[PDB]
Ligand binder design. Sequence first.
Ligand SMILES: Cc1cc2nc3c(=O)[nH]c(=O)nc-3n(C[C@H](O)[C@H](O)[C@H](O)COP(=O)(O)O)c2cc1C
Length: 173
Amino acid sequence: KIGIFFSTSTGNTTEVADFIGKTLGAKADAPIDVDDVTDPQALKDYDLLFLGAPTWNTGADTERSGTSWDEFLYDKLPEVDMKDLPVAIFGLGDAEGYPDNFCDAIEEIHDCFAKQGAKPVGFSNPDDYDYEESKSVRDGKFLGLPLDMVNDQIPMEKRVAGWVEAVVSETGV
Ligand SMILES: Cc1cc2nc3c(=O)[nH]c(=O)nc-3n(C[C@H](O)[C@H](O)[C@H](O)COP(=O)(O)O)c2cc1C
């Protein structure tokens, strides 16, 4: 079973989370907003997790999403043993408004989950979007899939569907 966990402030992330669900069909559970998670142990009942979050707190070291993820990452996640579970991160941002901080929240989610033993998958080509810098680019790769739903430089559906496919291939789920 594949799980989809996200959070949002203005609902853009929700749209993306729903779309992933549609591409996966019966293989995925309906997306769950992190704010709705009582038991963080639920995260472990899946074979693969798609995690999504926007970036709202520009330049912040921690709590970059400005969503329920900010509390969840530090108060709840530390209690979950995620050894070997693959997680694929998608993040929403604005390459035009924040050229130097493009989808910075991806790195935070990546690092927090990695610390729990999770295995990040679904890296993407940092060249897809035009931006100057991001904390989410490491070793020549984006640590997840960045999306710009503000400027729509790249049609969302085709980009996400291709990424989902790559993730399913990589993980064998
Ligand atoms: C106040 C504000 C700050 C933002 N900061 C960033 C940022 O630092 N980096 C980025 O890539 N996008 C930034 N954005 C863009 C948001 O991530 C984007 O609008 C996103 O689609 C919102 O996702 P949501 O509707 O799920 O909350 C910011 C937007 C606003 C309004």
